[PDB]
C-alpha cells in the first residue's frame, strides 16, 4: 500500500484533500459544549401542594405516584423527597443508553394512572414530568437599580416580555424563571370577615362565581330557522383582568342595603405565587433565567444568539432594569478551545524546528507540517460520524494523542533520510526500502494501541462515558495517523525529499549545523558504547528494573484519587445554614453580612453576589440560604492569592466567626454528577413498616459507629434534615357538630388563611395568571392568631377557632425521604486519607448489618455505578494485555519476543507518578489517559527497536548483540526528535496558571514526567529486555 | 447561651456523655427554644432516662411549661415513658398540671392507653374527675377509644 | 367551548406554544385560535 501510493502521489493527495474537506466540514458543523452527557438518563416528577407539610405531601401524593411507577423499562432505582415547603420530587434514574424521551413518556403516561387519585389542589397545580439536568449554559440576571421594582415586579416582566423570546432563541433547550409571574393576591383580614359574618369559604365561592369564563352560544346557530340573516357568537361572563375588578367582587348585601365588597375584607395586589424564596444581586432586588443548551446545539452560537435577543429587548425595558451574567460557561469554553488549538499549532511548529535541527532541509520539515493537520482534520470527521461534540474531554483527547501523531510523521521521514544517508539510494527507492522496514510494525502498532485504548470505551456508568470520549478520540486520531503513514507520507517522502550522498551525515558542514552533526554522531557512538557495556552486565539492570516496578507500585498507592481537577471558572458558592426553626428575616441578616464581606474584603476579585434566601441546592426552609459569588475576569485577578481556592479558604475562615449560623465557601466541581472520589452514597431503608422515629434511631446508631472508625470513614453525615417543632391542632368533631359548624368550613378557613388557596385563573394584560387567597401576614404568625379566625355555623352564629380546637407542640420531619418506594435516609461519607472507597463501603455494610430488625440498606448514585465499573476493570485490563500480546506475537512470529516490548510499561509510568507526586497532583482521568499515551509511545519506540533488531538477525544473519546495537543506533535520532518535540509541546500546559489550567496541568504534568523517564530509560532498557528474553528462550 | 443551645441538642439526641461534660461546664438547664422546651422537655419527649435524672440533679425546673402550657410530665406520660414519669413525680412534678387546653398528663396517658403510667399518676394523686376545655375526663377518653381495660382502672 | 378567538389564544394557544421549546428538529410552528373555541397547533419537523 505504501509502494502503491509512492508510484501514485496524486491519488495519495486526493485521499488527503477528501479527509481535509470532511474534517473542515465537520469542524464547522460539530456541536460545541464544555462537557458531553455523562450521567445516566433521569426523569423527575415535581408537584406543589400549597401550605402542605412533609407527611401530607408524602401520604397523599408521593406514595400514590410511587405505587403507580410500574411497567416502565430500564429503571435502575427510584428516589423521592416530600418536604414542608409543600413539594414532592420523585427522581427515576434509568440504565445508561436508555432513550430519555421513551423513559419520560412511559413515566408521564403512568402518572395519569395516579392523577385522579391525587388531591384536587395538586391536580390544579399540575405534576411536571421533566428530563433531569444539572448543567446550565448560563444564568441571565435581571435587576432594578433605581429601586422602583420588587423581585415580584422584575419576575413578572421577565415572564411576560423576555422568557418566551429566549425560549424561542436558536440552541436554547429549557428556561427556568427565578421567581413567578404576578398572581392576584387576596390578603384576607379575619376581623373584617367576622364583622360581616363571612369566612374564607365565602371569598373563594364569590371569586369562583364572579371571576369565570361562561359559555353562552350563538345567535342563529345550527340548526337555524330558514331565512335567518345573522350568525354571531354570544359572549357572556369573561375572566377579570385587574385588582380594581377583584376589589369590586360582591360578598353579601346587608339588611340596610349596604354592600360588602372583597376590598372591604382583604388587601388586593399583584404579587408572587411563592414568597419562600428572596433573590438579591449586590443587595438589589433580582429575578433571572436559568438557560440550558438544547440537544446537539453549539454553546458558543446559542450564547451569542441569547445576547443578540437580549440586545433587541434592551430598548423596551422599564427605567432601572439591567441584564447581568453572574454565570456563563462560554467564556471558559472559548479559552479551552483556543488553548488546545494553540497547543496543536505550537506542537506542529516545534516538530518543524526539531525536524530542521536534525535533518537540516526545509523539504523534510514540510511533510509532518502537511501530514499532521490532515490526521487532526480527519479525526473531527470521525468524531462527527460517531455523533460526538467538540468538548473539554474530546479536545484534550487530541492533545494527549499529539505525541503519537507527530511520531508517525517523524518516524517515516527520518527513516527515509537515514536510508539515503547510509546507502545513497534516490528518494523514491529509499522510501520504498524505508517503508519495507516499518510498514509491518506500523500496522502491528495500530492493532497494539487499539487493544490498549478500545477497551477503555467499555467501562459503564458516568466515569465509563468520560473514558469513552478519550478512547474513541485517541483511537480515531491514531487509526488515521497510521493510514496517512501508509498512504500520504510515503508519497510525500518519495516526491519532495532531495537526495543524500552515501556517508554524508553533515559532519563536513560549517557553522552551528556542522558542529551539531559532529556532536550528535559522537553522542551516538558514546550511546552504543554505553549499551555495549550495559549488555555485558544485564544482571544489575534486571535488579534496577525490579526497583523501578516496586517504586512505581509504592507511588501508585501514595497518589490520592480524583475524577476531574477543580477549575477557577470565575464563580463559587457560600452556604448559609442557620439553626432549624430560624425565620427568613434572620437568614437575610447573615446573607447581607456574607454579601457585605465579598464586596469589601474581596472588592478587587468579586464582581457580584447572588444572595438566594430559602434555597440551598433546592428550595429549602426559611433557615437555609445560598450566595453565588461571580468574580472579575481572570486577567484582573493575577497570582494564586486571587483565585477561587484562596478566596474560598479566606471567606470560610472569615465566616467561622459568624454565630448561630454555619457559613462556608466552596468551588464548583468540574461535573456535579460525579461528586467526590473516595466518596460514597448510602441509603438506610425501612423494610418492615418501622416508621420515621425508629429509622432515625437506626440512622443515629449507624452514624455513632461510623464515628468510632475515623481511620476508615470521614464526614459520615445525613444528607437530609432533622425533625423540628411543629404545631399540632386537634379539631374536636363533637364540639363542631354541637355548634352546627361543618369540618369542610373549618379545614378550608384554616387551610386558605394560614396555608394559602389557589382559587382560579385571571387574565393580566393578555396572560392567564393565578388567583391566591391567604391571610395578611399579621393574622397568621403566632398560635394566638388561631383564635382570631371565625367560622359561620348553620344557625348563622360566628364561632371562633379556639371554641372547637386544642393545640400542642410535637416534633416531625420537614423532609421525608423514600428509596425504591420504601422510607429511606441518605447518608454521605468518604474513605479516610490513604483508604480506598471499596474498603470504606465494606465497613459501612458491616456496621449496617448490626442495626435493628427491619432496617436494610442499598448503594445509590456514584456508589451504585462505582460497584458496576469496579467489577469490569479486571476483565478489560485482561483483554487489553491478551490482545496486545497476540498482536505482537503475530508481528514477530514468536510467543517470547512480545515480552521484550511489554516490559517497557513501567518506564513511562514511574516518571508520570514522580511528576504528579512532586507537583502535588492526583490520580485523575487526565493523568490516567496520559499514562496510556505515554505507555503507547514507549511501546511504539520498543516495537521498532525489536523489529529492526529481529529483522537484522533473520535477514542479514547478525548476532543478538550485533543486531541490538545496530537497532538502538538507528532508532536513537527518531526517538529523541519525538521526545524533544513532545516534551517542549506539553511544557506550556505544565506551567499554565490561567483559566482551565487545572486540566492543562493534569494533562501536561503526568505526560512530561512520563515522557522524560520513558525516553531516558527505554533507550538503555529496551536493548536489555530483547537480549534477556531472546537468551531465556534460546 | 452557646452551651444552653448545645445542651438542648445533647438532651434531645440522648448524648449522655456530652450532657455530663455540659453539666460540669455549667450549661444553662433552663435554656429554652422558640416553643419554650427545656432540655428536660426534650429528654422526656424522646425518652432519655439517664439525662432526665442528670438534669433534675443539676437543678432543672421539673414543672417548666412550654408556650402552650405543656410540662415534661405531659410529654413523658403521652409517649409512654414509664420510668421518666416515675422519676419526674418523685422530683415533685405537678401530677394535675393543666396545659392551655385544660389537658392533664392523665388525659394524654388515657388517650394513648398507657395503663402502667395511668396507675402511677393515680397513685401520685392525679384528679380522675379533671376536665379539659371540652368538659372531658380521662374516663370519657377511655369510653370513646373503646379501651375496656383503662375504662375499668378509672372506675 | 363558548370562548372567542382572543380568549382561546390567551388561555390555551400561547400556554401550549410557550411549552413547545427544546424539541429536536422543529422546522416551524403554525397555529390558529377560532371563535368556535377550536385550537390547532401544527409542528413541522426536519426532513428525515
Ligand atoms: C489563529 C488560531 O489560533 O487558530 C484559528 C485558526 C483556525 C484554527 C480557527 C478555528 C477553525 O476555524 C480553523 C479551520 C480548521 C476551520 C475549518 C476551515 O475553515 C479551515 C480553513 C480553518 C483553518 C484554521 C482555522 C480558521 C482558530 C481558532 C479556533 C476558533 C474558535 C474559538 C471559539 C476560539 C483559534 O483562534 O484558536
Ligand atoms: C492544525 C489543525 C487545527 C484544527 C483546529 C481544530 C479547531 C476545533 C475547535 C472548534 C473550531 C470551530 O468552532 C467554531 O468557532 C467559532 C468562532 O468564530 C464559533 O462561533 C461562535 O462563537 C463566537 C465567539 O463567541 C461568536 O462570535 C460567533 O458569533 C459564534 O457563531 C462557532 O460556534 C464554532 O463552531
Ligand atoms: C480479526 C483478526 C485480526 C488479526 C489481528 C492480527 C494483527 C497482526 C499485526 C500486524 C502484523 C504485520 O504483518 C506483517 O506483514 C508483512 C507484510 O505482509 C510481513 O512482512 C514479511 O515480509 C517478507 C515476506 O515477503 C518476510 O520475509 C519477512 O520476514 C516479513 O517482514 C510480516 O510477515 C507480517 O508480520
Ligand atoms: C541521572 C539519573 C539517570 C539514570 C538512568 C538510569 C538508567 C541507566 C543509565 C545508563 C548509563 C550506564 O552507563 C554505562 O554503564 C555500564 C555499567 O554496566 C558501563 O559498563 C562498564 O562497566 C561494566 C561493569 O563495571 C562492565 O561490565 C563493562 O564492560 C564496562 O564497559 C558503561 O561504561 C557505561 O557507559
Ligand atoms: C504494551 C502493554 C500495555 C498494556 C496497558 C494495559 C492498560 C489497559 C487500560 C484499560 O483498558 O483501562 C483504562 C483505565 C481506566 O481505569 O485507564 C487507567 O486507569 C490507566 C491504566 C494504568 C496502567 C498502569 C500499568 C501498570 C503496570 C504494572
Ligand atoms: C489543497 C491541497 C492541494 C495540494 C496539491 C499538491 C500538488 C503537488 C502534487 C504533485 C504534482 C506533480 C505531479 C506528480
Ligand atoms: C558516566 C558513564 C558514561 C555514560 C554515557 C552515557 C551516554 C549517553 C549518550 C546519549 C546522548 C543522546
Ligand atoms: C566553522 C566554525 C565552527 C562553529 C563552532 C560552533 C560551536 C559553538 C556553538 C554552540
Ligand atoms: C494465550 C496463548 C498462549 C500460547 C502459548 C504457546 C506456548 C507454546 C510453546 C512452544
Ligand atoms: C492496493 C492499494 C489499495 C488502496 C486502497 C485505498
Ligand atoms: C469545507 C471546508 C474545508 C476546509 C479544508 C481545510
Ligand atoms: C498471555 C501470555 C501467555 C504466553 C505464554 C508463553
Contact (CB<8Å) A581/B5:
no
* E strand segments, A863-926: none
Does B99 lie at the interface with A, CB-CB under 8 angstroms?
Answer: yes
DSSP assignment of A680-702, as one string?
Answer: EEEEEEE-SS--HHHHHHHHHHH
The residue whose grid cell reads 335567518 is A228
Q: Find the length of chain B.
A: 155
CA of A834 to the centre of ligand 5 (A): 21
Whether there are 3 or more C-beta pairs closer than 8 Å between A and B is: yes
* A932 Cβ closer than 6 Å to some ligand 5 atom: yes
Atom of ligand 10 nearest to the CA of A15: 6
Chains interfacing with C (3 or more CB pairs < 8 Å): A
Contact (CB<8Å) A167/C14:
no
Residue nearest ligand 8's atom 4 by CA: A511
Could you tell me if A227 and A252 are in contact, meaning their C-beta atoms sit under 8 angstroms apart? Answer: no
Domain spans in chain B, listed from the N-terminal domain onward: 1-155
Q: For residue C3, which residues of chain A lie inside 8 Å, CB to CB?
A: 213, 215
Residue A232 main-chain phi, psi, to 5 deg: -125, 140
Residue A910 main-chain phi, psi, to 5 deg: -60, -45
CA A188 from chain centre, in angstroms, equals: 46
Task: Output DSSP code: residue A662.
Answer: E
Interatomic CA distance for residues A322 and A141, integer angstroms = 8
Could you tell me if A680 and A830 are in contact, meaning their C-beta atoms sit under 8 angstroms apart? Answer: yes
Contact (CB<8Å) A175/C7:
no
DSSP assignment of A115-163, as one string?
Answer: GGGS-HHHHHH-EEEEE-----SEEEEEEESSS---HHHHHHHHHHHTH
Residue A13 main-chain phi, psi, to 5 deg: -65, -40
Helix (H) or strand (E) holding A808: strand A805-812
A640: CATH: 3.30.70.1430
Residues 6+ apart with CB under 8 A from A782: none
Interatomic CA distance for residues A493 and A733, integer angstroms = 99
Q: Is the N-terminal amide bond of A286 cis, ω within 30° of 0?
A: no
Method: X-ray
**What are the grid coordinates assigned to A814, written together?**
420537614
C-alpha distance from A784 to closest chain B C-alpha (Å): 10
On whether both A809 and A733 belong to a single domain, the answer is yes
Cα-based distances in Å from A192 to A678, A790, B44: 62, 11, 43
Cα-based distances in Å from A143 to A275, A305, A1026: 18, 21, 72
Choose among C2, C11, C24: nearest Cβ to A214.
C2
Residue A50 main-chain phi, psi, to 5 deg: -50, 125
CA of A525 to the centre of ligand 7 (A): 9
Chain A residue with minimum CA distance to B70: A808
**What are the grid coordinates assigned to A331, written together?**
467564556
C-alpha distance from B7 to closest chain A C-alpha (Å): 14
CA of A376 to the centre of ligand 1 (A): 13
Helix (H) or strand (E) holding A74: none
A734: CATH: 3.30.2090.10
C-alpha distance from A211 to closest chain C C-alpha (Å): 14
Interatomic CA distance for residues A550 and A913, integer angstroms = 12
**What are the grid coordinates assigned to A971, written together?**
532508532
CA B63 from chain centre, in angstroms, equals: 9
CA dihedral for A913, A919, A925, A931, sign (positive or negative): negative
Interatomic CA distance for residues A886 and A882, integer angstroms = 6
> Which residues share a beta bridge with A824?
A685, A817
Contact (CB<8Å) A768/C24:
no
Cα-based distances in Å from A91 to A63, A717, A821: 13, 22, 11
Q: Which of C1, C2, C7, C34 to mutate to test the interface with A (most CBs of A within 10 A)?
A: C2
CA dihedral for B112, B115, B116, B118, sign (positive or negative): positive
Could you tell me if A929 and A474 are in contact, meaning their C-beta atoms sit under 8 angstroms apart? Answer: yes
Contact (CB<8Å) C24/A235:
no
Neighbours of B21 (CB within 10 A): 13
CA angle A400, A402, A403 (to 5 degrees): 95
Chain B residue with minimum CA distance to A731: B134
Does A175 lie at the interface with C, CB-CB under 8 angstroms?
Answer: yes
C-alpha distance from B46 to closest chain A C-alpha (Å): 10
Q: Which of A586, A660, A808, A811 to mutate to test the interface with B (most CBs of B within 10 A)?
A: A808
C-alpha distance from C8 to closest chain A C-alpha (Å): 11
> Which residues share a beta bridge with A234?
A217
Nearest ligand to the CA atom of A902: 5
- The gap between the terminal CA atoms of chain A, to the nearest Å, is 35
Three-state secondary structure call for residue A19: helix
Could you tell me if B68 and B99 are in contact, meaning their C-beta atoms sit under 8 angstroms apart? Answer: yes
Q: For residue B37, which residues of chain A lie inside 8 Å, CB to CB?
A: 725, 809
Among C5, C3, C29, C25, residue whose Cα is nearest residue C16:
C29
Residue to mutate (ligand 3; options A440, A939, A947; most atoms within 8 A of CB): A440
Contact (CB<8Å) A809/B34:
no
Full residue range of the structural domain in which residue A576 is found = 571-667
* E strand segments, A550-636: 571-577, 606-613, 624-631
Contacts of range A505-514, beta carbons closer than 8 Å, 24 or more positions apart? A505/A421, A506/A360, A509/A360, A513/A360
Interatomic CA distance for residues A397 and A1003, integer angstroms = 9
Three-state secondary structure call for residue A270: strand
Helix (H) or strand (E) holding A30: none
Interatomic CA distance for residues A173 and A100, integer angstroms = 14
Amino acid at each position: 500500500m505504501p509502494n502503491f501510493f509512492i508510484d501514485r502521489p496524486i491519488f495519495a493527495w486526493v485521499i488527503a484533500i477528501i479527509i481535509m474537506l470532511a474534517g473542515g466540514l465537520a469542524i464547522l458543523k460539530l456541536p460545541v459544549a464544555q462537557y458531553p452527557t455523562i450521567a445516566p438518563p433521569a426523569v423527575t416528577i415535581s408537584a406543589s401542594y400549597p401550605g402542605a407539610d412533609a407527611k401530607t405531601v408524602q401520604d397523599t401524593v408521593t406514595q400514590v405516584i410511587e405505587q403507580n411507577m410500574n411497567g416502565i423499562d430500564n429503571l435502575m432505582y427510584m428516589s423521592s423527597n416530600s418536604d414542608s415547603t409543600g413539594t414532592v420530587q420523585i427522581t427515576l434514574t434509568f440504565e445508561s443508553g436508555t432513550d430519555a424521551d421513551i423513559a419520560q413518556v412511559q413515566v408521564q403516561n403512568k402518572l395519569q394512572l395516579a392523577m385522579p387519585l391525587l388531591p384536587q389542589e395538586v391536580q390544579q397545580q399540575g405534576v411536571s414530568v421533566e428530563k433531569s439536568s444539572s448543567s446550565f449554559l448560563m444564568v441571565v440576571g435581571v435587576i432594578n437599580t433605581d429601586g422602583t421594582m420588587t423581585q415580584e415586579d422584575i419576575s413578572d416582566y421577565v415572564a411576560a416580555n423576555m422568557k418566551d423570546a429566549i425560549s424561542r432563541t436558536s440552541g436554547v433547550g429549557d428556561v427556568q424563571l427565578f421567581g413567578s409571574q404576578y398572581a392576584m393576591r387576596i390578603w384576607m383580614n379575619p376581623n373584617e370577615l367576622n364583622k360581616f359574618q363571612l369566612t374564607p369559604v365565602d371569598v373563594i365561592t364569590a371569586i369562583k362565581a364572579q371571576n369565570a369564563q361562561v359559555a353562552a352560544g350563538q345567535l342563529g346557530g345550527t340548526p337555524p330557522v330558514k331565512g335567518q340573516q345573522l350568525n354571531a357568537s354570544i359572549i357572556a361572563q369573561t375572566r377579570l383582568t385587574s385588582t380594581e375588578e377583584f376589589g369590586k367582587i360582591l360578598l353579601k348585601v346587608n339588611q340596610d342595603g349596604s354592600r360588602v365588597l372583597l376590598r372591604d375584607v382583604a388587601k388586593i395586589e399583584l404579587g408572587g405565587e411563592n414568597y419562600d424564596i428572596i433573590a438579591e444581586f449586590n443587595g438589589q432586588p433580582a429575578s433571572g433565567l436559568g438557560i440550558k443548551l438544547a440537544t446537539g446545539a453549539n454553546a458558543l452560537d446559542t450564547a451569542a444568539a441569547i445576547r443578540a435577543e437580549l440586545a433587541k429587548m434592551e430598548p423596551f425595558f422599564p427605567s432601572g432594569l439591567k441584564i447581568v451574567y453572574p454565570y456563563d460557561t462560554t467564556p471558559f469554553v472559548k479559552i479551552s478551545i483556543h488553548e488546545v488549538v494553540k497547543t496543536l499549532v505550537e506542537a506542529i511548529i516545534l516538530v518543524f524546528l526539531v525536524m530542521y535541527l536534525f535533518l537540516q532541509n526545509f523539504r523534510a520539515t514540510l511533510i509532518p507540517t502537511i501530514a499532521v493537520p490532515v490526521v487532526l482534520l480527519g479525526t473531527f470527521a470521525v468524531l462527527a460520524a460517531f455523533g460526538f461534540s467538540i468538548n473539554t474531554l474530546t479536545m484534550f483527547g487530541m492533545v494527549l494523542a499529539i505525541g503519537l501523531l507527530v511520531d508517525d510523521a517523524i518516524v517515516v521521514v527520518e527513516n527515509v533520510e537515514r536510508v539515503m544517508a547510509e546507502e545513497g539510494l534516490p528518494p523514491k527507492e529509499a522510501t520504498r526500502k524505508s517503508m519495507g522496514q516499518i510498514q509491518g510494525a506500523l500496522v502491528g502498532i495500530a492493532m497494539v494501541l487499539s487493544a490498549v485504548f478500545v477497551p477503555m470505551a467499555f467501562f459503564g456508568g458516568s466515569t465509563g462515558a468520560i473514558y469513552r470520549q478519550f478512547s474513541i478520540t485517541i483511537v480515531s486520531a491514531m487509526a488515521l495517523s497510521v493510514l496517512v503513514a501508509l498512504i500520504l507520507t510515503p508519497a510525500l517522502c518519495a516526491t519532495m525529499l532531495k537526495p543524500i550522498a552515501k556517508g554524508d551525515h553533515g559532519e563536513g558542514k560549517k557553522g552551528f549545523f556542522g558542529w551539531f552533526n559532529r556532536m550528535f554522531e559522537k553522542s551516538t557512538h558514546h550511546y552504543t558504547d554505553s549499551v555495549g557495556g550495559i549488555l555485558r552486565s544485564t544482571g544489575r539492570y534486571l535488579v534496577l528494573y525490579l526497583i523501578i516496578v516496586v517504586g512505581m507500585a509504592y507511588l501508585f498507592v501514595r497518589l490520592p484519587s480524583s475524577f476531574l481537577p477543580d477549575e477557577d471558572q470565575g464563580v463559587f458558592m457560600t452556604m448559609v445554614q442557620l439553626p432549624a426553626g430560624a425565620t427568613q428575616e434572620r437568614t437575610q441578616k447573615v446573607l447581607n453580612e456574607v454579601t457585605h464581606y465579598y464586596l469589601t474584603k474581596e472588592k478587587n476579585n468579586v464582581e457580584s453576589v447572588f444572595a438566594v434566601n430559602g434555597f440551598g441546592f433546592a428550595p429549602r426552609p426559611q433557615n437555609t440560604g445560598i450566595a453565588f459569588v461571580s468574580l472579575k475576569d481572570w486577567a484582573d485577578r493575577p497570582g494564586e492569592e486571587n483565585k477561587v481556592e484562596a478566596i474560598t479558604m479566606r471567606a470560610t475562615r472569615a465566616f467561622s466567626q459568624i454565630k448561630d449560623a454555619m457559613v462556608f465557601a466552596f468551588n464548583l466541581p468540574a461535573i456535579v454528577e460525579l461528586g467526590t472520589a473516595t466518596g460514597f452514597d448510602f441509603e438506610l431503608i425501612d423494610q418492615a413498616g418501622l416508621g420515621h422515629e425508629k429509622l432515625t434511631q437506626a440512622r443515629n446508631q449507624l452514624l455513632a459507629e461510623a464515628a468510632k472508625h475515623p481511620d476508615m470513614l470521614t464526614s459520615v453525615r445525613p444528607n437530609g434534615l432533622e425533625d423540628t417543632p411543629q404545631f399540632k391542632i386537634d379539631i374536636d368533631q363533637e364540639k363542631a357538630q354541637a355548634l352546627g359548624v361543618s369540618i369542610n368550613d373549618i379545614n378550608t378557613t384554616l387551610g386558605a388563611a394560614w396555608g394559602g388557596s389557589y382559587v382560579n385563573d385571571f387574565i393580566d394584560r393578555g396572560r392567564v395568571k393565578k388567583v391566591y387567597v391567604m391571610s395578611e401576614a399579621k393574622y397568621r404568625m403566632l398560635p394566638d392568631d388561631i383564635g382570631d379566625w371565625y367560622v359561620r355555623a348553620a344557625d348563622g352564629q360566628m364561632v371562633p377557632f379556639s371554641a372547637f380546637s386544642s393545640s400542642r407542640w410535637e416534633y416531625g420531619s420537614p423532609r421525608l425521604e423514600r428509596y425504591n418506594g420504601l422510607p429511606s435516609m441518605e447518608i454521605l461519607g468518604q474513605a479516610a486519607p490513604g483508604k480506598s472507597t471499596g474498603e470504606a463501603m465494606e465497613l459501612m455494610e458491616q456496621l449496617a448489618s448490626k442495626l435493628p430488625t427491619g432496617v436494610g440498606y442499598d448503594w445509590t448514585g456514584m456508589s451504585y455505578q462505582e460497584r458496576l465499573s469496579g467489577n469490569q476493570a479486571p476483565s478489560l485490563y485482561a483483554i487489553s494485555l491478551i490482545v496486545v500480546f497476540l498482536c505482537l506475537a503475530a508481528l514477530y512470529e514468536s510467543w517470547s519476543i512480545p515480552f521484550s516490548v511489554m516490559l517497557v510499561v513501567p518506564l513511562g509510568v514511574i516518571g508520570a507518578l514522580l511528576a504528579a507526586t512532586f507537583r502535588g497532583l492526583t490520580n485523575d482521568v487526565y493523568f490516567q489517559v496520559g499514562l496510556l499515551t505515554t505507555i503507547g509511545l514507549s511501546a511504539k519506540n520498543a516495537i521498532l527497536i525489536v523489529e529492526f533488531a529481529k529483522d537484522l538477525m533473520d535477514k542479514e544473519g547478525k548476532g543478538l548483540i550485533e543486531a541490538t546495537l545496530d537497532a538502538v543506533r538507528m532508532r536513537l535520532r527518531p526517538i529523541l526528535m519525538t521526545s524533544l518535540a513532545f516534551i517542549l509541546g506539553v511544557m506550556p500546559l505544565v506551567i499554565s496558571t490561567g483559566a482551565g489550567s487545572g486540566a492543562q496541568n493534569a494533562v501536561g504534568t503526568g505526560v512530561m514526567g512520563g515522557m522524560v523517564t520513558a525516553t531516558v530509560l527505554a533507550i538503555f532498557f529496551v536493548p536489555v529486555f530483547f537480549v534477556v528474553v531472546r537468551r531465556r528462550f534460546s | 447561651s452557646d452551651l444552653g443551645k448545645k445542651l438542648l441538642e445533647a438532651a434531645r439526641a440522648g448524648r449522655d456523655d456530652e450532657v455530663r461534660i455540659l453539666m460540669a461546664n455549667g450549661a444553662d438547664v433552663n435554656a429554652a427554644d422558640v416553643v419554650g422546651w427545656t432540655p428536660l422537655h426534650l429528654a422526656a419527649y424522646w425518652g432519655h432516662l439517664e439525662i432526665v435524672e442528670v438534669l433534675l440533679k443539676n437543678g432543672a425546673d421539673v414543672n417548666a411549661y412550654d408556650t402552650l402550657g405543656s410540662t415534661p410530665l405531659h410529654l413523658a406520660a403521652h409517649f409512654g415513658h414509664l420510668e421518666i414519669v416515675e422519676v419526674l413525680l418523685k422530683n415533685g412534678a405537678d401530677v394535675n398540671a393543666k396545659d392551655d387546653n385544660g389537658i392533664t398528663p392523665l388525659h394524654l396517658a388515657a388517650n394513648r392507653g398507657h395503663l402502667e403510667i395511668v396507675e402511677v399518676l393515680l397513685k401520685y394523686g392525679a384528679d380522675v374527675n379533671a376536665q379539659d376545655k371540652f368538659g372531658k375526663t380521662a374516663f370519657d377518653i377511655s369510653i370513646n377509644n373503646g379501651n375496656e381495660d383503662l375504662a375499668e382502672i378509672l372506675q
